[PDB]
């Protein structure tokens, strides 16, 4: 076995049906007999007990500490990791055929595969084919000018930029990425620092990073407006399921 | 033993028996030199033997000499393959060389006792130059009381064709000498063209006298059968791609007057060797099998 | 079990029996992400084949052998069973799926047969780890002696034919030809090279990128103009995807055309190929056994209009994309192998000596 | 970053008005940058058209001059071709052969000389014996000696070269002359009738002319002062 | 004056790019231009008219020697003046050796009837097309040429067969024939050049057009036609050439090697390759030379003919003195 499904939670079973049920069901839509979930401990390290009342095919739950990011959660869960991982988030409501994303991880033997959607602040730049992303940054770390290296333009003279895209927080990741995460404690969150680090490190036996663009669904974001939109669309989403 | 003594040994062996093939005399010279060498190491044998091989090749630039030398050295390697000791090796060298010499001596008669069955009575025979093998097979055909007509070209560089005509008139056979430029004009009256081979290349093509290639092409144009006779020891691991690719050490010293041409296997009907009647692929098979 | 890839688009009546898939349609859409049929050494290789990430026959063989090494390493015996037979019975579906993704070549057929023979030769008393280690060692030795040493010997042999001041014509992206030319240029040979390419793959540019990187003077042109350039060509050198027992050469589509025109222009033809690529099966034409690639690659943008845009909407219209063809033996003058320089008619002889 | 500036623009009288209002503007780049920094006021969006099937370039230096000459000789700017004679003049009549060997009228190639490829010879030229000319352009009325080697050079009209010279990647203006046993390094330049003295090999970067100060060296019968 | 500027515009159009794409349009325009030349320019004897025509035809041919429709139309006109002068005032063979001012209207009417007969060459070829195609045949063509497309798309009105069209790379215009002909229900197939021989065994006969037919019967066609003819000869399949009568030009292959037409190498190799374009020499000819030994038949507006007879048609169209022009 080489994929080990991993679910992050740092959520709340809100909605008509429990929120965490929605992504987990997707895992049982395509194989994935076993799954690892990590719960929060700042509120209470017992949400696993509450979640144990569901009826999924098979569940594995692990408590965490009070303060721990996604990268910190992976750092804690590493001893249970033996192969490539598939990190998801509890807040994610989508009907994506997952087989596309892993195909980028499969065909090109990439070091990272992610899902990215046309939202309806953070800049990303992919190549002409729209598969291998080349640059990514956020306005938080940029003052007024966006900087592009000469070498990347030498290797790729045509970059297509996207601005309003929304991440789905789903990533196929290699094992040596987790080993490097072990080697350095300076990383606390995946999205905040880890992905841009790899993107920059692609250009110093190299690093391959790919993103798949979708046009159907986003994740239930922290704002309550996203939860309301997810509730509105849940009837249509579950009509097929 | 010195190179000079080798040279007079080779020349005397040639002169004593004019009927002996050049490669046979070369192999006999190599065997005699091996007989009196007083070497101790097989590598010392190989170096001296190959050096004598280039010496004789300089003496006689024929392809047959080089083919015989290559066959001799491969025989040395085969004998040394399963004899760690050197004295047993040397004795086996001598005895197998005696057997090899007697077999190549009988090879011409072996070819004759097989080739003559293709000579239809009343047919027409076409030949290029003075080849002893075709003369022997014609003698065998005559012995079987068969009647046939023979045309022979003159081989312009040295008129060996007239010598073959004399040797055939000595056997009471109807023979006619024709110009080297009239082959096409004669190709209509022929029935099958038998010719000797100076040497045989990997795929079955033949290294032979300069006028052979045009005759083969003309015969292929008229779709007449074209038979080539040669012995086993004339095989060689050469492979020209065209007439130019032939090494210069065989063309000359034997404006521009090359003594040698190459004929492709596509224009050859059959080969007549002591092993039997062979397709051109059989030569390549034998060469592949010999070298592992 | 694995589903069946859907044939895409109508086919020519003469090619009704051959399959024809589309690069857009990937079989993995109907397979579990955590591959449950068997471990996913299947899917990586199958996707890289179907999507055409690896093209060279030697590259395909090396990738397949690496993937199957991973298969053997991850494989474990089931209780109450014999490895020497269960391994092959389990490996057959791998071959079926790989053929579904893309039809196999002669080199991969020989590799599969060799590995099946090796597995069968494994005794029933030896231990699991020893068997796995010896299988991996046998695969490594096969790769070494059948690719690397063979290429070096063939380059040494070909160094003799390549003369100074001549012109050598090549075709397509073939690793053996490129390595031969590079090594020959290394040894001080001075010559030109003429590159002939053909649509739609246009992989010939590959070797061009090599030739300039090796400093070799070169020229590039499409296949139809070959008849224009042959008069100044002195030798034609072609790589081969397979050799058949009848001496014919199974290769890329344009090989037979180049051989025929070269014969019509009185130019010697060389075919360089390794012994392991020799195949016992025979055929007389490209119709009985071929492979039809995605016809959508035939569409080209000339000016501002694509003529074959909606080709599916014309019932009478048909598109074929051949990838292989057969050159008759009589148009071939050389086969350059580690065994030496042989005629085409001697191809079966090698098959006899290497079989035992 | 894959675009090439062909220096071709389609303009409106608004461009003239903006130029006559904005005094500081001097070049096209200045106008483009000024319009793209003064966005909200007089928006005036600028549009772009990209072509990928036709050739267009602007020569601005010897590097671009050599690149454009190599492209033109190799028929990259068809229908524009040295043998096409787009300017109907008698002198530029040419004949096209294998390897893009363009030959004018009255060339009189010498015995043993070899034109390898991508070579254009002006009318009235004279070529010596055993010459080796490659990827070069020779102007009309030139005169070349024996055993001369020319690689990627450019000779204008009236240039005279003595026998035995070796010339690589340099440029010789009209009416220049080179004596015997002279070797020119790549990127050399000879301008306006400067004659290089015998038995000298100029360095890599060697631009010479009659005018003293601008040229790195000025001379008429040598290279040492 | 006005005729002179029209002539200059015609020459510039030939030099830059052919406006009227079809060769028949070239022939009609050349004949019309010669008509205004004859009517406008003043001349007393026929000799000055002939030399003026020689000068104008020399200029037009030197504009673009790649295509020869203008040249042989001019030669046909010159033969017309020669014939009219001989008729109103009074062929090299052994028989000849052993034996020994109002023509303007006649010239004009001769040119007019020449145009009239030139109008219907396509229709005549289509009319005779049905006698060379049988049911369930397999036909292969190359590139694009309106003559053969009209041929097949009218001969399929009463027959059913299969047609294979090989794209003439880089100018993949065979797709245009494929689309147009499949828009008539012919069950056509689109193929690359590299597969020609690969399929050539399973083709009954091959019909092709041409750009110019030389005196010896050898022709100049699109690139890759020579390979197709060689494959045909190898498989001994008959080869049909559909060419109207004006595509017959009296030159010979060995003439200065200005025979092919080399276009920009952009089509063969895109400019985006970059650095490697310096050391690499690229050639993109658009025409190939097919020898007469590989040709089986010639179909023209007058009927069928053998290549060995082509020379005779030269004597009936062009006077020997006007070959050089």
Curated annotation (Swiss-Prot), chain B:
Keywords from the named record: Acetylation, Cytoplasm, Disease variant, Initiation factor, Leukodystrophy, Protein biosynthesis
Record GO cellular component, one term: eukaryotic translation initiation factor 2B complex
UniProt disease link: Leukoencephalopathy with vanishing white matter 1: An autosomal recessive brain disease characterized by neurological features including progressive cerebellar ataxia, spasticity, and cognitive deficits. Brain imaging shows abnormal white matter that vanishes over time and is replaced by cerebrospinal fluid. Disease severity ranges from fatal infantile forms to adult forms without neurological deterioration. The disease is progressive with, in most individuals, additional episodes of rapid deterioration following febrile infections or minor head trauma.
Keyword Transcription: no
Gene Ontology MF term list: guanyl-nucleotide exchange factor activity; identical protein binding; translation initiation factor activity
N6-acetyllysine: modified positions: 35
Originating gene: EIF2B1
Activity control summary: Activated by the chemical integrated stress response (ISR) inhibitor ISRIB which stimulates guanine nucleotide exchange factor activity for both phosphorylated and unphosphorylated eIF2.
Record bears the keyword Protein biosynthesis: yes
Family matches, as InterPro entries: eIF2B_alpha/beta/delta, elF-2B_alpha_N, IF-2B-related, IF_2B-like_C, NagB/RpiA_transferase-like
Name of the protein: Translation initiation factor eIF2B subunit alpha
Cellular compartments annotated: Cytoplasm, Cytosol
Broad class of the protein's primary localization: cytoplasm
The family this protein is said to belong to: Belongs to the eIF-2B alpha/beta/delta subunits family.
Domain of life: Eukaryota
From Swiss-Prot, chain C:
Main localization, broad class: cytoplasm
Record-annotated disulphide pairs: none
Activity control: Activated by the chemical integrated stress response (ISR) inhibitor ISRIB which stimulates guanine nucleotide exchange factor activity for both phosphorylated and unphosphorylated eIF2.
One of the record's GO cellular component terms: eukaryotic translation initiation factor 2B complex
Domain of life: Eukaryota
Gene Ontology BP terms: cytoplasmic translational initiation; myelination; oligodendrocyte development; ovarian follicle development; regulation of translation; response to glucose; response to heat; response to peptide hormone
Annotated consequence of substituting residue 324 to H: In VWM4; with ovarian failure
Location in or out of the cell: Cytoplasm, Cytosol
Keywords, sorted A to Z: Acetylation, Cytoplasm, Disease variant, Initiation factor, Leukodystrophy, Phosphoprotein, Protein biosynthesis
Family, as annotated: Belongs to the eIF-2B alpha/beta/delta subunits family.
Subunit structure: Component of the translation initiation factor 2B (eIF2B) complex which is a heterodecamer of two sets of five different subunits: alpha, beta, gamma, delta and epsilon. Subunits alpha, beta and delta comprise a regulatory subcomplex and subunits epsilon and gamma comprise a catalytic subcomplex. Within the complex, the hexameric regulatory complex resides at the center, with the two heterodimeric catalytic subcomplexes bound on opposite sides.
Protein name per the record: Translation initiation factor eIF2B subunit delta
Curated annotation (Swiss-Prot), chain D:
Signal peptide span: none
Organism superkingdom: Eukaryota
Principal location listed in the UniProt entry: cytoplasm
Any one GO molecular-function label of the UniProt entry: translation initiation factor activity
GO BP: any one term: astrocyte development
Reported modifications of this chain: Phosphorylated on serine and threonine residues by GSK3B; phosphorylation inhibits its function. Polyubiquitinated, probably by NEDD4.
Chain positions with Phosphoserine modification: 209, 225
Function recorded in the entry: Acts as a component of the translation initiation factor 2B (eIF2B) complex, which catalyzes the exchange of GDP for GTP on eukaryotic initiation factor 2 (eIF2) gamma subunit. Its guanine nucleotide exchange factor activity is repressed when bound to eIF2 complex phosphorylated on the alpha subunit, thereby limiting the amount of methionyl-initiator methionine tRNA available to the ribosome and consequently global translation is repressed.
Descriptive protein name: Translation initiation factor eIF2B subunit epsilon
Species name: Homo sapiens
Residues of the full protein shown: 242 to 466 of 721
Swiss-Prot record, chain E:
Keyword Transcription attached: no
Superkingdom of source: Eukaryota
Effect ascribed to mutating residue 187 to G: In VWM2; with and without ovarian failure
UniProt note on regulation of activity: Activated by the chemical integrated stress response (ISR) inhibitor ISRIB which stimulates guanine nucleotide exchange factor activity for both phosphorylated and unphosphorylated eIF2.
Transmembrane feature ranges: none
Result of altering residue 145 to F: In VWM2; with ovarian failure
GO MF annotations in UniProt: ATP binding; GTP binding; guanyl-nucleotide exchange factor activity; translation initiation factor activity
Location in the cell: Cytoplasm, Cytosol
Keyword annotations from UniProtKB, A to Z: Cytoplasm, Disease variant, Initiation factor, Leukodystrophy, Protein biosynthesis
One GO CC term, this protein: eukaryotic translation initiation factor 2B complex
Homology family: Belongs to the eIF-2B alpha/beta/delta subunits family.
UniProt disease annotation: Leukoencephalopathy with vanishing white matter 2: An autosomal recessive brain disease characterized by neurological features including progressive cerebellar ataxia, spasticity, and cognitive deficits. Brain imaging shows abnormal white matter that vanishes over time and is replaced by cerebrospinal fluid. Disease severity ranges from fatal infantile forms to adult forms without neurological deterioration. The disease is progressive with, in most individuals, additional episodes of rapid deterioration following febrile infections or minor head trauma.
Protein name, as recorded: Translation initiation factor eIF2B subunit beta
Protein's organism: Homo sapiens (Human)
């Amino acid at each position: 076995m080489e994929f080990q499904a991993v679910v992050m939670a740092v959520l709340l079973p809100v909605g008509n049906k429990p929120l965490i049920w929605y992504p987990l069901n997707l895992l049982e839509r395509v194989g994935f007999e076993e799954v690892i979930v990590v719960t929060t401990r700042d509120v209470q390290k017992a949400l696993c007990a509450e979640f144990k009342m569901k009826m999924k095919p098979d569940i594995v739950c692990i408590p965490d500490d009070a303060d721990m990011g996604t990268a910190d959660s992976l750092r804690y869960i590493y001893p249970k990791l033996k192969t490539d991982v598939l990190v998801l988030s509890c807040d994610l409501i989508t009907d994506v055929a997952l087989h596309e994303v892993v195909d980028l991880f499969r065909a090109y033997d990439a070091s990272l595969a992610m899902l990215m959607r046309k939202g309806q602040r953070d800049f990303i730049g992919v190549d002409s084919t729209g598969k291998r992303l080349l640059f990514m940054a956020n306005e938080a770390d940029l003052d007024e000018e966006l900087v592009i290296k000469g070498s990347i333009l030498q290797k790729h003279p045509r970059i297509r930029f996207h601005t309003g895209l929304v991440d789905a927080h789903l990533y196929c990741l290699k094992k040596y990425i987790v080993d490097f995460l072990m080697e350095n404690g300076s990383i606390t969150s995946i999205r905040s620092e880890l992905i841009p680090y790899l993107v920059r490190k692609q250009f110093s036996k190299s690093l391959d990073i790919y993103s798949f663009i979708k046009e159907a669904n986003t994740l239930n974001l922290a704002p309550y407006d996203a939860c309301w939109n997810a509730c509105r669309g849940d009837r249509w989403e579950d009509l097929s399921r | 033993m010195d190179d000079k003594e080798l040279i007079e040994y080779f020349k005397s062996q040639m002169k004593e028996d004019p009927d002996m093939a050049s490669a046979v005399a070369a192999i006999r010279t190599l065997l005699e030199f091996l007989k009196r060498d007083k070497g101790e190491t097989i590598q010392g044998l190989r170096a001296n033997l190959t050096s004598a091989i280039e010496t004789l090749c300089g003496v006689d630039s024929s392809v047959a000499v080089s083919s015989g030398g290559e066959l001799f050295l491969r025989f040395i390697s085969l004998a040394s393959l399963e004899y760690s000791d050197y004295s047993k090796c040397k004795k086996i060298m001598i005895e197998r060389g005696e057997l090899f010499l007697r077999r190549i001596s009988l090879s011409r008669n072996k070819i004759a006792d097989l080739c003559h069955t293709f000579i239809k009575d009343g047919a027409t025979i076409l030949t290029h130059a003075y080849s002893r093998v075709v003369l022997r097979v014609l003698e065998a055909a005559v012995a079987a009381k068969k009647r046939f007509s023979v045309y022979v070209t003159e081989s312009q560089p040295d008129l060996s064709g007239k010598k073959m005509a004399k040797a055939l008139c000595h056997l009471n056979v109807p023979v006619t000498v024709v110009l080297d430029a009239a082959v096409g004009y004669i190709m209509e009256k022929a029935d099958l063209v038998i010719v000797g081979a100076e040497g045989v290349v990997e795929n079955g093509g033949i290294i032979n006298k300069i006028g052979t290639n045009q005759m083969a092409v003309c015969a292929k144009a008229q779709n007449k059968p074209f038979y080539v006779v040669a012995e086993s020891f004339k095989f060689v691991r050469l492979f020209p791609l065209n007439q130019q690719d032939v090494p210069d050490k065989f063309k000359y010293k034997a404006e521009e007057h090359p003594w040698v041409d190459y004929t492709a296997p596509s224009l050859i009907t059959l080969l007549f060797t002591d092993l039997g009647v062979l397709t051109p692929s059989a030569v390549s098979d034998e060469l592949i099998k010999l070298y592992l | 079990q694995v589903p069946t890839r859907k044939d895409y688009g109508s086919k020519v009546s003469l090619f009704s029996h051959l399959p024809q898939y589309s690069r857009q349609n990937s079989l993995t859409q109907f397979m579990s992400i955590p591959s449950s049929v068997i471990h996913p050494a299947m899917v990586r290789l199958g996707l890289q084949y179907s999507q055409g990430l690896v093209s060279g026959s030697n590259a395909r063989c090396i990738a397949l052998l690496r993937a199957l090494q991973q298969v053997i390493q991850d494989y474990t015996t089931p209780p109450n069973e014999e490895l020497s037979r269960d391994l092959v019975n389990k490996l057959k579906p791998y071959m079926s799926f790989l053929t579904q993704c893309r039809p196999l070549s002669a080199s991969m057929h020989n590799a599969i047969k060799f590995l099946n023979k090796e597995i069968t030769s494994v005794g029933s008393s030896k231990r699991e780890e020893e068997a796995k280690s010896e299988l991996r060692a046998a695969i490594d030795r096969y790769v070494q002696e059948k690719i690397v040493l063979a290429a070096q010997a063939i380059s040494r042999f070909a160094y003799q034919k390549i003369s100074n001041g001549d012109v050598i014509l090549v075709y397509g992206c073939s690793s053996l030809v490129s390595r031969i030319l590079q090594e020959a240029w290394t040894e001080g040979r001075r010559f030109r090279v003429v590159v002939v390419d053909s649509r739609p793959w246009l992989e010939g540019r590959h070797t061009l990128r090599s030739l300039v990187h090796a400093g070799v003077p070169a020229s590039y042109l499409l296949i139809p103009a070959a008849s224009y350039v042959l008069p100044e060509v002195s030798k034609v050198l072609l790589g081969a995807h397979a050799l058949l027992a009848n001496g014919s050469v199974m290769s890329r589509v344009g090989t037979a055309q180049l051989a025929l025109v070269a014969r019509a222009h009185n130019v010697p033809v060389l075919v360089c190929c390794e012994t392991y690529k020799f195949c016992e099966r025979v055929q007389t034409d490209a119709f009985v056994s071929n492979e039809l690639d995605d016809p959508d690659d035939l569409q080209c943008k000339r000016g501002e209009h694509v003529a074959l845009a909606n080709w599916q909407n014309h019932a009478s219209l048909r598109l074929l994309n051949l990838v292989y063809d057969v050159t008759p033996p009589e148009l071939v003058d050389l086969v350059i192998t580690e065994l030496g320089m042989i005629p085409c008619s001697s191809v079966p002889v090698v098959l006899r000596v290497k079989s035992s | 970053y894959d675009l090439l500036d062909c220096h071709i623009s389609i303009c409106s009288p608004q461009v003239a008005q903006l130029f006559t209002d904005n005094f500081d503007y001097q070049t096209r780049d200045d106008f483009v940058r000024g319009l793209l920094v003064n966005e909200e006021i007089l928006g005036n969006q600028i549009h772009m058209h990209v072509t990928a099937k036709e050739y267009g370039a602007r020569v601005s230096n010897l590097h671009m001059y050599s690149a454009v000459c190599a492209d033109v000789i190799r028929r990259w700017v068809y229908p524009l071709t040295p043998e096409a004679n787009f300017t109907d003049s008698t002198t530029q009549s040419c004949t096209h052969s294998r390897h893009n060997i363009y030959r004018g009228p009255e060339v009189s190639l010498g015995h043993g000389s070899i034109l390898e490829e991508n070579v254009l010879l002006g009318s009235g030229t004279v070529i010596g014996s055993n010459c080796f000319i490659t990827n070069s352009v020779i102007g009309p009325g030139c005169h070349i000696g024996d055993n001369v080697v020319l690689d990627q050079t450019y000779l204008w009209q009236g240039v005279r070269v003595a026998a035995g010279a070796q010339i690589h990647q340099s440029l010789l203006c009209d009416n220049a002359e080179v004596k015997e046993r002279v070797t020119l390094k790549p990127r050399s330049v000879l301008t306006s009738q400067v004659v290089v003295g015998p038995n000298i090999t100029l360095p890599e970067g060697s631009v010479i002319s009659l005018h003293p100060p601008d040229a790195e060296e000025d001379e008429d019968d040598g290279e040492f002062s | 004056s006005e005729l002179s500027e029209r002539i200059e515009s015609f020459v510039e159009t030939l030099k830059r790019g052919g406006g009227p794409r079809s060769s028949e349009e070239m022939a009609r325009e050349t004949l019309g231009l010669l008509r205004q030349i004859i009517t406008d320019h003043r001349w007393s004897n026929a000799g000055e008219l002939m030399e003026l025509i020689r000068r104008e035809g020399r200029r037009m041919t030197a504009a673009q020697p790649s295509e020869t429709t203008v040249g042989n139309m001019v030669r046909r006109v010159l033969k017309i003046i020669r014939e009219e002068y001989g008729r109103l005032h009074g062929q090299e063979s052994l028989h000849k050796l052993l034996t020994s001012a109002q023509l303007q209207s006649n010239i004009i009417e001769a040119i007019n009837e020449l145009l009239v007969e030139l109008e219907g060459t396509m229709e005549n070829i289509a009319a005779q097309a049905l006698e060379h195609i049988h049911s369930n045949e397999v036909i292969m063509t190359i590139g694009f040429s309106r003559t053969v497309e009209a041929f097949l798309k009218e001969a399929a009105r009463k027959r059913k067969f299969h047609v294979i069209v090989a794209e003439c790379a880089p100018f993949c215009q065979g797709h245009e024939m494929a689309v147009n002909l499949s828009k008539a229900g012919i069950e056509t197939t689109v193929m690359t050049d590299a597969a020609i021989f690969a399929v050539m065994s399973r083709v009954n006969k091959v019909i092709i057009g041409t750009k110019t037919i030389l005196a010896n019967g050898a022709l100049r066609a699109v690139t890759g036609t020579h390979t197709l003819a060689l494959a045909a000869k190898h498989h001994s399949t008959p080869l049909i050439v559909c060419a109207p009568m004006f595509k017959l030009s009296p030159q010979f292959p060995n003439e200065e090697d200005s025979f092919h037409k080399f276009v920009a190498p952009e089509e063969v190799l895109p400019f985006t390759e970059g650095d490697i374009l310096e050391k690499v020499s690229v050639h993109c000819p658009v025409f190939d030379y097919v020898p007469p030994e590989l040709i089986t038949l010639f179909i023209s507006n007058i009927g069928g003919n053998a290549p060995s007879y082509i020379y005779r048609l030269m004597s009936e169209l062009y006077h020997p003195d006007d070959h050089v022009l």
